[PDB]
Design a protein around this ligand. Structure first.
Ligand code: HEM
Ligand SMILES: C[C@]12CC[C@H](O)CC1=CC[C@@H]1[C@@H]2CC[C@]2(C)C(c3cccnc3)=CC[C@@H]12
Length: 464
Protein backbone atom coordinates (compact mmCIF):
# COMPACT_ATOMS: atom_id res chain seq x y z
CA UNK A 1 0.00 0.00 0.00
CA UNK A 2 0.94 3.74 -0.15
CA UNK A 3 0.96 7.12 1.67
CA UNK A 4 -1.71 9.45 0.27
CA UNK A 5 -0.40 12.58 -1.51
CA UNK A 6 -0.05 15.45 0.99
CA UNK A 7 -1.07 18.83 -0.43
CA UNK A 8 -0.98 20.64 2.87
CA UNK A 9 0.30 20.03 6.33
CA UNK A 10 -0.12 22.05 9.53
CA UNK A 11 1.34 20.85 12.82
CA UNK A 12 -1.68 21.73 14.99
CA UNK A 13 -5.39 22.68 14.64
CA UNK A 14 -6.19 26.26 13.66
CA UNK A 15 -8.50 28.20 15.98
CA UNK A 16 -7.80 25.57 18.60
CA UNK A 17 -6.02 26.83 21.73
CA UNK A 18 -4.07 30.08 21.83
CA UNK A 19 -1.50 30.24 19.03
CA UNK A 20 1.38 31.46 21.14
CA UNK A 21 0.83 28.39 23.22
CA UNK A 22 0.51 25.96 20.29
CA UNK A 23 3.81 27.33 19.00
CA UNK A 24 5.45 26.83 22.43
CA UNK A 25 4.14 23.29 22.55
CA UNK A 26 5.89 22.41 19.27
CA UNK A 27 9.25 23.44 20.65
CA UNK A 28 9.40 20.00 22.42
CA UNK A 29 9.34 18.44 18.92
CA UNK A 30 11.23 20.87 16.61
CA UNK A 31 13.49 23.10 18.78
CA UNK A 32 13.22 26.84 19.51
CA UNK A 33 13.23 28.02 15.84
CA UNK A 34 11.26 26.79 12.83
CA UNK A 35 9.30 28.03 9.90
CA UNK A 36 5.93 27.75 8.22
CA UNK A 37 4.81 28.34 4.57
CA UNK A 38 1.44 29.80 3.42
CA UNK A 39 1.21 30.41 -0.35
CA UNK A 40 4.36 32.41 -1.21
CA UNK A 41 5.05 33.55 2.43
CA UNK A 42 7.58 31.98 4.85
CA UNK A 43 7.31 32.77 8.55
CA UNK A 44 9.94 32.15 11.20
CA UNK A 45 8.90 31.56 14.87
CA UNK A 46 11.54 32.08 17.62
CA UNK A 47 11.02 30.81 21.14
CA UNK A 48 14.28 31.26 23.14
CA UNK A 49 15.78 34.36 24.75
CA UNK A 50 19.17 33.99 23.10
CA UNK A 51 17.79 33.68 19.49
CA UNK A 52 15.27 36.40 20.26
CA UNK A 53 18.09 38.69 21.43
CA UNK A 54 19.73 38.07 18.09
CA UNK A 55 16.61 39.28 16.21
CA UNK A 56 15.72 42.18 18.49
CA UNK A 57 19.17 43.54 19.50
CA UNK A 58 22.32 42.14 17.75
CA UNK A 59 20.73 42.24 14.30
CA UNK A 60 18.17 44.85 15.30
CA UNK A 61 18.23 46.81 12.01
CA UNK A 62 18.17 43.56 9.93
CA UNK A 63 14.85 42.51 11.59
CA UNK A 64 13.30 45.89 12.28
CA UNK A 65 10.78 45.69 9.41
CA UNK A 66 7.03 45.05 9.52
CA UNK A 67 5.18 42.69 7.24
CA UNK A 68 2.28 43.88 5.17
CA UNK A 69 -1.22 42.70 6.17
CA UNK A 70 -4.41 43.78 4.40
CA UNK A 71 -5.85 44.43 7.87
CA UNK A 72 -2.97 46.57 9.11
CA UNK A 73 -3.01 48.47 5.80
CA UNK A 74 -6.41 49.71 6.93
CA UNK A 75 -5.58 50.43 10.57
CA UNK A 76 -2.44 52.36 9.57
CA UNK A 77 -3.82 54.24 6.53
CA UNK A 78 -1.48 52.35 4.11
CA UNK A 79 1.53 51.76 6.43
CA UNK A 80 1.89 55.14 8.20
CA UNK A 81 2.40 55.90 11.91
CA UNK A 82 4.93 53.98 13.99
CA UNK A 83 3.63 50.60 14.98
CA UNK A 84 2.64 48.89 11.75
CA UNK A 85 4.94 51.10 9.71
CA UNK A 86 7.77 49.28 7.93
CA UNK A 87 11.37 50.43 8.59
CA UNK A 88 12.37 53.45 6.56
CA UNK A 89 12.49 57.21 6.69
CA UNK A 90 8.75 57.37 7.55
CA UNK A 91 9.13 55.14 10.65
CA UNK A 92 12.46 56.42 12.00
CA UNK A 93 11.35 60.07 11.87
CA UNK A 94 8.01 59.64 13.50
CA UNK A 95 9.50 57.32 16.15
CA UNK A 96 12.22 59.81 17.16
CA UNK A 97 9.77 62.73 17.21
CA UNK A 98 7.31 60.91 19.51
CA UNK A 99 10.20 59.99 21.72
CA UNK A 100 11.44 63.59 21.79
CA UNK A 101 7.93 64.59 22.80
CA UNK A 102 8.19 62.45 25.95
CA UNK A 103 11.12 64.56 27.35
CA UNK A 104 8.87 67.64 27.46
CA UNK A 105 7.44 65.86 30.54
CA UNK A 106 10.62 65.18 32.57
CA UNK A 107 10.42 67.95 35.24
CA UNK A 108 8.15 70.82 36.38
CA UNK A 109 4.44 71.73 36.19
CA UNK A 110 3.97 69.30 33.28
CA UNK A 111 5.78 66.47 35.16
CA UNK A 112 4.32 63.18 33.83
CA UNK A 113 3.51 62.20 37.43
CA UNK A 114 1.35 65.32 37.97
CA UNK A 115 -0.64 64.66 34.79
CA UNK A 116 -1.04 60.99 35.82
CA UNK A 117 -2.04 61.80 39.40
CA UNK A 118 -4.71 64.41 38.55
CA UNK A 119 -6.59 61.73 36.59
CA UNK A 120 -6.15 58.95 39.10
CA UNK A 121 -7.64 61.49 41.50
CA UNK A 122 -10.79 62.03 39.37
CA UNK A 123 -10.78 58.26 38.79
CA UNK A 124 -10.69 57.37 42.54
CA UNK A 125 -13.42 60.00 43.18
CA UNK A 126 -15.83 58.48 40.63
CA UNK A 127 -15.11 55.01 41.83
CA UNK A 128 -15.92 56.10 45.40
CA UNK A 129 -19.54 56.90 44.65
CA UNK A 130 -19.97 53.10 43.90
CA UNK A 131 -19.18 52.34 47.57
CA UNK A 132 -20.70 48.93 48.36
CA UNK A 133 -21.41 47.88 44.74
CA UNK A 134 -19.83 45.48 42.07
CA UNK A 135 -18.85 47.27 38.91
CA UNK A 136 -16.92 46.61 35.81
CA UNK A 137 -14.09 49.11 36.09
CA UNK A 138 -13.10 49.10 32.41
CA UNK A 139 -14.59 52.47 31.38
CA UNK A 140 -13.50 54.47 34.44
CA UNK A 141 -9.90 53.28 33.73
CA UNK A 142 -10.19 53.82 29.98
CA UNK A 143 -11.30 57.39 30.84
CA UNK A 144 -8.41 58.27 33.13
CA UNK A 145 -5.75 57.00 30.72
CA UNK A 146 -7.62 58.44 27.68
CA UNK A 147 -7.10 61.77 29.44
CA UNK A 148 -3.42 61.38 30.17
CA UNK A 149 -2.69 60.50 26.56
CA UNK A 150 -4.92 63.36 25.33
CA UNK A 151 -3.11 65.95 27.50
CA UNK A 152 0.20 64.55 26.33
CA UNK A 153 -0.94 64.62 22.64
CA UNK A 154 -2.93 67.88 22.61
CA UNK A 155 -3.11 69.57 26.04
CA UNK A 156 -6.88 68.81 26.17
CA UNK A 157 -8.94 66.49 28.36
CA UNK A 158 -12.58 65.33 28.49
CA UNK A 159 -14.91 66.64 31.25
CA UNK A 160 -17.02 63.97 33.00
CA UNK A 161 -19.79 62.49 30.75
CA UNK A 162 -18.54 63.90 27.48
CA UNK A 163 -20.07 61.44 24.92
CA UNK A 164 -16.84 61.46 22.80
CA UNK A 165 -15.28 59.04 25.31
CA UNK A 166 -18.13 56.62 24.48
CA UNK A 167 -17.52 57.08 20.73
CA UNK A 168 -13.84 56.29 21.14
CA UNK A 169 -14.46 53.22 23.38
CA UNK A 170 -16.75 51.93 20.64
CA UNK A 171 -14.46 52.13 17.60
CA UNK A 172 -11.56 50.93 19.81
CA UNK A 173 -13.66 47.84 20.70
CA UNK A 174 -14.60 47.38 17.00
CA UNK A 175 -11.05 47.81 15.66
CA UNK A 176 -9.43 45.43 18.14
CA UNK A 177 -12.29 43.07 17.29
CA UNK A 178 -11.77 43.20 13.47
CA UNK A 179 -8.01 43.64 13.39
CA UNK A 180 -7.57 39.90 13.97
CA UNK A 181 -9.83 37.06 15.20
CA UNK A 182 -7.19 35.63 17.48
CA UNK A 183 -3.54 36.80 17.39
CA UNK A 184 -1.91 38.99 14.65
CA UNK A 185 -0.28 35.77 13.60
CA UNK A 186 -3.17 34.62 11.47
CA UNK A 187 -1.84 31.39 10.07
CA UNK A 188 -4.24 30.54 7.19
CA UNK A 189 -5.30 33.78 5.39
CA UNK A 190 -8.99 33.01 6.07
CA UNK A 191 -10.16 36.42 4.85
CA UNK A 192 -8.85 35.92 1.29
CA UNK A 193 -10.41 32.39 1.11
CA UNK A 194 -14.13 33.02 1.76
CA UNK A 195 -16.52 36.01 1.27
CA UNK A 196 -16.69 38.17 4.38
CA UNK A 197 -17.35 41.65 5.68
CA UNK A 198 -14.37 42.01 8.04
CA UNK A 199 -12.41 44.55 5.98
CA UNK A 200 -15.70 46.32 5.31
CA UNK A 201 -16.39 46.31 9.08
CA UNK A 202 -12.84 47.35 9.92
CA UNK A 203 -12.78 50.23 7.35
CA UNK A 204 -15.85 51.81 8.88
CA UNK A 205 -14.62 51.76 12.48
CA UNK A 206 -11.36 53.34 11.22
CA UNK A 207 -13.37 55.86 9.18
CA UNK A 208 -14.99 57.14 12.41
CA UNK A 209 -11.57 57.20 14.19
CA UNK A 210 -9.90 59.04 11.28
CA UNK A 211 -12.86 61.45 11.17
CA UNK A 212 -12.50 62.34 14.87
CA UNK A 213 -8.77 62.81 14.37
CA UNK A 214 -9.36 65.00 11.26
CA UNK A 215 -11.70 67.33 13.22
CA UNK A 216 -9.11 67.85 16.02
CA UNK A 217 -6.22 68.43 13.58
CA UNK A 218 -8.02 71.03 11.41
CA UNK A 219 -9.49 72.65 14.61
CA UNK A 220 -5.90 72.96 15.91
CA UNK A 221 -4.04 74.44 12.84
CA UNK A 222 -5.30 77.84 14.14
CA UNK A 223 -4.31 77.30 17.85
CA UNK A 224 -0.72 76.23 16.85
CA UNK A 225 2.27 78.51 17.62
CA UNK A 226 6.11 78.11 17.22
CA UNK A 227 6.99 79.55 20.65
CA UNK A 228 4.88 76.88 22.44
CA UNK A 229 5.89 73.21 22.20
CA UNK A 230 4.07 71.51 25.09
CA UNK A 231 2.47 68.36 23.52
CA UNK A 232 3.06 65.75 20.77
CA UNK A 233 1.05 67.47 18.06
CA UNK A 234 3.24 70.56 18.49
CA UNK A 235 6.37 68.39 18.00
CA UNK A 236 4.99 66.99 14.76
CA UNK A 237 4.01 70.42 13.38
CA UNK A 238 7.33 71.92 14.59
CA UNK A 239 8.87 69.38 12.20
CA UNK A 240 6.59 69.97 9.19
CA UNK A 241 7.27 73.72 9.41
CA UNK A 242 11.13 73.80 9.53
CA UNK A 243 11.41 71.28 6.64
CA UNK A 244 11.05 65.60 4.96
CA UNK A 245 8.01 67.10 3.06
CA UNK A 246 6.77 63.73 1.81
CA UNK A 247 7.24 62.39 5.39
CA UNK A 248 5.02 64.69 7.49
CA UNK A 249 1.90 65.01 5.31
CA UNK A 250 -1.50 65.40 7.03
CA UNK A 251 -2.25 61.66 6.85
CA UNK A 252 1.15 60.80 8.25
CA UNK A 253 0.67 63.03 11.40
CA UNK A 254 -2.91 61.93 12.05
CA UNK A 255 -1.85 58.24 11.99
CA UNK A 256 1.14 58.71 14.32
CA UNK A 257 -1.16 60.44 16.85
CA UNK A 258 -3.66 57.59 16.23
CA UNK A 259 -1.13 54.96 17.23
CA UNK A 260 -0.16 56.74 20.46
CA UNK A 261 -3.78 57.34 21.42
CA UNK A 262 -4.59 53.67 20.71
CA UNK A 263 -1.51 52.36 22.42
CA UNK A 264 -1.61 54.70 25.45
CA UNK A 265 -5.15 53.67 26.32
CA UNK A 266 -5.66 49.99 25.54
CA UNK A 267 -2.47 48.45 26.88
CA UNK A 268 -2.62 50.10 30.24
CA UNK A 269 -6.30 49.38 30.65
CA UNK A 270 -5.83 45.76 29.82
CA UNK A 271 -2.91 45.37 32.31
CA UNK A 272 -4.77 47.18 35.05
CA UNK A 273 -7.62 44.76 34.38
CA UNK A 274 -5.35 41.72 34.48
CA UNK A 275 -3.68 42.91 37.67
CA UNK A 276 -7.02 43.22 39.42
CA UNK A 277 -7.98 39.66 38.27
CA UNK A 278 -4.79 38.09 39.45
CA UNK A 279 -5.30 39.94 42.70
CA UNK A 280 -8.81 38.55 43.10
CA UNK A 281 -7.49 34.95 42.68
CA UNK A 282 -4.69 35.68 45.09
CA UNK A 283 -6.10 36.97 48.45
CA UNK A 284 -2.80 36.16 50.21
CA UNK A 285 -0.84 38.54 47.91
CA UNK A 286 -3.60 41.20 48.04
CA UNK A 287 -3.41 41.29 51.89
CA UNK A 288 0.38 41.80 51.92
CA UNK A 289 0.06 44.74 49.43
CA UNK A 290 -2.37 46.55 51.70
CA UNK A 291 -0.02 45.85 54.64
CA UNK A 292 3.01 47.04 52.59
CA UNK A 293 1.07 50.14 51.40
CA UNK A 294 0.14 51.01 55.02
CA UNK A 295 3.61 50.53 56.56
CA UNK A 296 5.26 52.63 53.91
CA UNK A 297 2.88 55.33 52.71
CA UNK A 298 0.13 55.44 55.38
CA UNK A 299 -2.76 57.92 55.00
CA UNK A 300 -1.17 61.37 55.29
CA UNK A 301 -0.92 61.76 51.45
CA UNK A 302 -1.64 60.08 48.11
CA UNK A 303 1.02 57.73 46.57
CA UNK A 304 3.90 58.97 44.51
CA UNK A 305 6.48 57.79 41.92
CA UNK A 306 9.16 58.19 44.64
CA UNK A 307 7.23 55.31 46.35
CA UNK A 308 8.47 52.77 43.76
CA UNK A 309 11.59 52.62 45.97
CA UNK A 310 9.51 51.10 48.85
CA UNK A 311 6.33 49.49 47.50
CA UNK A 312 8.49 46.69 46.15
CA UNK A 313 5.91 43.90 46.17
CA UNK A 314 3.59 46.18 44.19
CA UNK A 315 6.25 46.66 41.52
CA UNK A 316 6.91 42.89 41.68
CA UNK A 317 3.20 42.17 41.10
CA UNK A 318 3.15 44.33 38.05
CA UNK A 319 6.42 42.70 36.85
CA UNK A 320 4.76 39.28 37.34
CA UNK A 321 1.56 40.23 35.47
CA UNK A 322 3.61 41.49 32.55
CA UNK A 323 5.32 38.11 32.59
CA UNK A 324 2.36 35.68 32.92
CA UNK A 325 0.11 37.70 30.64
CA UNK A 326 2.33 39.61 28.22
CA UNK A 327 0.45 42.46 26.60
CA UNK A 328 1.95 41.26 23.34
CA UNK A 329 2.59 37.46 23.68
CA UNK A 330 4.20 37.41 20.25
CA UNK A 331 5.18 41.04 20.24
CA UNK A 332 4.17 42.57 16.88
CA UNK A 333 5.56 40.71 13.84
CA UNK A 334 9.09 41.46 12.61
CA UNK A 335 10.46 41.20 9.02
CA UNK A 336 13.90 40.60 7.47
CA UNK A 337 15.10 43.81 5.74
CA UNK A 338 18.13 42.14 4.07
CA UNK A 339 19.17 38.42 3.69
CA UNK A 340 20.48 37.33 7.15
CA UNK A 341 20.49 34.73 9.90
CA UNK A 342 19.09 33.57 13.18
CA UNK A 343 21.10 31.02 15.22
CA UNK A 344 23.20 30.76 12.10
CA UNK A 345 20.20 29.61 9.91
CA UNK A 346 19.48 31.54 6.73
CA UNK A 347 16.54 33.91 6.75
CA UNK A 348 15.85 35.62 3.41
CA UNK A 349 14.80 39.20 2.66
CA UNK A 350 11.05 39.63 3.35
CA UNK A 351 10.49 36.66 5.69
CA UNK A 352 8.12 37.21 8.60
CA UNK A 353 9.83 36.72 11.96
CA UNK A 354 7.81 36.20 15.13
CA UNK A 355 9.25 36.15 18.67
CA UNK A 356 7.12 33.96 20.87
CA UNK A 357 7.49 36.04 24.01
CA UNK A 358 5.07 33.76 25.75
CA UNK A 359 7.56 30.85 25.35
CA UNK A 360 10.33 32.97 26.92
CA UNK A 361 8.18 33.95 29.86
CA UNK A 362 7.22 30.29 30.32
CA UNK A 363 10.58 28.55 29.58
CA UNK A 364 10.77 25.88 32.37
CA UNK A 365 14.61 26.05 32.68
CA UNK A 366 14.43 29.80 33.22
CA UNK A 367 11.55 29.98 35.63
CA UNK A 368 10.82 27.90 38.77
CA UNK A 369 7.12 27.16 38.32
CA UNK A 370 6.29 29.31 35.29
CA UNK A 371 2.47 28.56 35.32
CA UNK A 372 2.09 30.21 38.80
CA UNK A 373 1.34 33.83 39.69
CA UNK A 374 4.23 34.45 42.12
CA UNK A 375 5.34 38.11 42.57
CA UNK A 376 7.93 36.68 45.00
CA UNK A 377 9.94 35.56 41.99
CA UNK A 378 10.97 39.22 41.56
CA UNK A 379 12.24 39.81 45.12
CA UNK A 380 15.25 38.73 47.14
CA UNK A 381 14.31 35.97 49.72
CA UNK A 382 13.96 38.45 52.63
CA UNK A 383 11.58 40.97 50.98
CA UNK A 384 13.83 44.10 50.71
CA UNK A 385 15.11 44.33 47.11
CA UNK A 386 13.88 43.74 43.56
CA UNK A 387 15.70 41.07 41.54
CA UNK A 388 15.99 40.17 37.77
CA UNK A 389 15.58 36.42 38.19
CA UNK A 390 15.87 35.44 34.51
CA UNK A 391 17.12 36.92 31.26
CA UNK A 392 14.20 35.21 29.41
CA UNK A 393 12.01 38.30 30.05
CA UNK A 394 11.05 41.17 27.72
CA UNK A 395 7.53 42.50 28.37
CA UNK A 396 8.45 45.70 26.54
CA UNK A 397 10.54 43.89 23.93
CA UNK A 398 13.86 45.45 22.89
CA UNK A 399 15.95 47.18 20.18
CA UNK A 400 14.78 49.30 17.23
CA UNK A 401 11.11 48.27 17.75
CA UNK A 402 11.00 48.27 21.59
CA UNK A 403 7.99 49.88 23.24
CA UNK A 404 8.08 53.71 23.33
CA UNK A 405 5.36 53.93 25.95
CA UNK A 406 7.38 52.08 28.50
CA UNK A 407 8.09 54.88 30.98
CA UNK A 408 4.46 55.99 30.52
CA UNK A 409 3.05 52.53 31.09
CA UNK A 410 5.29 51.82 34.12
CA UNK A 411 4.26 54.96 35.97
CA UNK A 412 0.59 54.60 34.96
CA UNK A 413 0.43 51.04 36.31
CA UNK A 414 2.25 51.70 39.54
CA UNK A 415 0.26 54.83 40.30
CA UNK A 416 -3.10 53.40 39.43
CA UNK A 417 -2.45 50.31 41.59
CA UNK A 418 -1.21 52.30 44.57
CA UNK A 419 -4.00 54.83 44.76
CA UNK A 420 -6.51 52.02 44.28
CA UNK A 421 -4.95 49.84 46.98
CA UNK A 422 -4.81 52.80 49.46
CA UNK A 423 -8.43 53.94 49.16
CA UNK A 424 -10.37 50.74 48.31
CA UNK A 425 -11.02 47.24 49.48
CA UNK A 426 -11.39 45.25 46.22
CA UNK A 427 -13.31 42.05 46.68
CA UNK A 428 -15.17 39.25 44.93
CA UNK A 429 -18.76 40.26 44.07
CA UNK A 430 -21.66 38.89 46.24
CA UNK A 431 -22.11 36.11 43.63
CA UNK A 432 -18.68 34.54 44.07
CA UNK A 433 -17.69 34.89 40.35
CA UNK A 434 -13.94 35.12 39.81
CA UNK A 435 -12.72 36.23 36.30
CA UNK A 436 -11.45 33.72 33.78
CA UNK A 437 -7.68 34.00 33.60
CA UNK A 438 -7.54 32.22 30.24
CA UNK A 439 -7.55 35.51 28.26
CA UNK A 440 -8.57 36.56 24.74
CA UNK A 441 -5.67 36.94 22.32
CA UNK A 442 -5.99 39.94 19.97
CA UNK A 443 -3.52 42.71 19.08
CA UNK A 444 -3.40 43.19 22.78
CA UNK A 445 -3.89 40.11 25.04
CA UNK A 446 -7.22 40.92 26.76
CA UNK A 447 -9.18 39.55 29.70
CA UNK A 448 -12.99 39.00 29.67
CA UNK A 449 -14.70 41.77 31.50
CA UNK A 450 -15.58 40.99 35.08
CA UNK A 451 -16.89 42.75 38.12
CA UNK A 452 -15.15 43.80 41.33
CA UNK A 453 -16.79 44.73 44.56
CA UNK A 454 -15.35 48.12 45.43
CA UNK A 455 -15.73 49.39 49.04
CA UNK A 456 -14.18 52.34 50.87
CA UNK A 457 -11.45 51.20 53.32
CA UNK A 458 -11.97 51.18 57.07
CA UNK A 459 -8.45 52.56 57.55
CA UNK A 460 -8.86 55.29 54.81
CA UNK A 461 -11.95 56.86 56.53
CA UNK A 462 -10.77 56.32 60.16
CA UNK A 463 -8.30 59.14 59.20
CA UNK A 464 -10.50 62.04 58.01
C1 HEM B 1 2.09 47.46 29.91
C2 HEM B 1 1.89 48.25 28.89
C3 HEM B 1 2.75 47.98 27.63
C4 HEM B 1 3.44 46.86 27.28
C5 HEM B 1 3.57 45.50 28.05
C6 HEM B 1 4.06 47.13 26.01
C7 HEM B 1 4.89 46.30 25.27
C8 HEM B 1 5.22 46.49 23.95
C9 HEM B 1 5.79 45.53 23.07
C10 HEM B 1 6.16 44.08 23.47
C11 HEM B 1 5.93 46.12 21.85
C12 HEM B 1 6.47 45.51 20.52
C13 HEM B 1 7.95 45.13 20.37
C14 HEM B 1 8.19 44.51 19.00
O1 HEM B 1 7.36 44.73 18.09
O2 HEM B 1 9.21 43.79 18.80
C15 HEM B 1 5.44 47.46 21.93
C16 HEM B 1 5.44 48.37 20.88
C17 HEM B 1 4.94 49.65 20.84
N1 HEM B 1 4.33 50.25 21.90
FE1 HEM B 1 4.05 49.29 23.82
N2 HEM B 1 3.69 48.39 25.64
C18 HEM B 1 2.92 48.95 26.61
C19 HEM B 1 2.43 50.22 26.64
C20 HEM B 1 2.53 51.17 25.66
C21 HEM B 1 2.09 52.55 25.75
C22 HEM B 1 1.48 53.21 27.04
C23 HEM B 1 2.33 53.13 24.55
C24 HEM B 1 2.08 54.57 24.06
C25 HEM B 1 2.39 55.60 24.81
C26 HEM B 1 2.91 52.14 23.71
C27 HEM B 1 3.28 52.38 22.43
C28 HEM B 1 3.92 51.52 21.60
C29 HEM B 1 4.24 51.82 20.24
C30 HEM B 1 3.89 53.15 19.57
C31 HEM B 1 4.93 50.57 19.72
C32 HEM B 1 5.50 50.36 18.30
C33 HEM B 1 7.03 50.52 18.30
C34 HEM B 1 7.58 50.48 16.88
O3 HEM B 1 6.95 49.90 15.99
O4 HEM B 1 8.65 51.04 16.58
N3 HEM B 1 3.03 50.95 24.40
N4 HEM B 1 5.01 47.65 23.23
C1 LIG C 1 -5.40 48.91 17.39
C2 LIG C 1 -5.18 50.16 18.22
C3 LIG C 1 -6.27 50.13 19.30
C4 LIG C 1 -7.64 50.61 18.85
C5 LIG C 1 -7.59 52.01 18.30
O1 LIG C 1 -8.89 52.33 17.83
C6 LIG C 1 -6.63 52.08 17.10
C7 LIG C 1 -5.30 51.44 17.39
C8 LIG C 1 -4.25 52.08 16.88
C9 LIG C 1 -2.83 51.81 17.28
C10 LIG C 1 -2.63 50.46 17.96
C11 LIG C 1 -3.81 50.16 18.91
C12 LIG C 1 -3.58 48.95 19.81
C13 LIG C 1 -2.20 48.96 20.49
C14 LIG C 1 -1.11 49.09 19.47
C15 LIG C 1 -1.03 47.86 18.55
C16 LIG C 1 0.30 49.29 19.94
C17 LIG C 1 0.94 48.54 21.08
C18 LIG C 1 0.66 47.17 21.28
C19 LIG C 1 1.26 46.50 22.33
C20 LIG C 1 2.12 47.21 23.15
N1 LIG C 1 2.38 48.52 22.95
C21 LIG C 1 1.81 49.19 21.94
C22 LIG C 1 1.04 50.33 19.10
C23 LIG C 1 -0.06 50.92 18.24
C24 LIG C 1 -1.38 50.44 18.84
Amino acid sequence: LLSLPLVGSLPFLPRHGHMHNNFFKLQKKYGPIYSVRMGTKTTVIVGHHQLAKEVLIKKGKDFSGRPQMATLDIASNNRKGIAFADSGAHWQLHRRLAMATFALFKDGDQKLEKIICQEISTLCDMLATHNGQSIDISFPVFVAVTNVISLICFNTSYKNGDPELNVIQNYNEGIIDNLSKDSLVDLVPWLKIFPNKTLEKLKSHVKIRNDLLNKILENYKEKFRSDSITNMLDTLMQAKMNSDSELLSDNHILTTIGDIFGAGVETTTSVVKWTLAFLLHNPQVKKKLYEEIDQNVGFSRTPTISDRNRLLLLEATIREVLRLRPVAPMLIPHKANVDSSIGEFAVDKGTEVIINLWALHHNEKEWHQPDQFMPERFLNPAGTQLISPSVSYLPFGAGPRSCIGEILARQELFLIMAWLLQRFDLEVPDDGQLPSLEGIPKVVFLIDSFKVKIKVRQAWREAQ
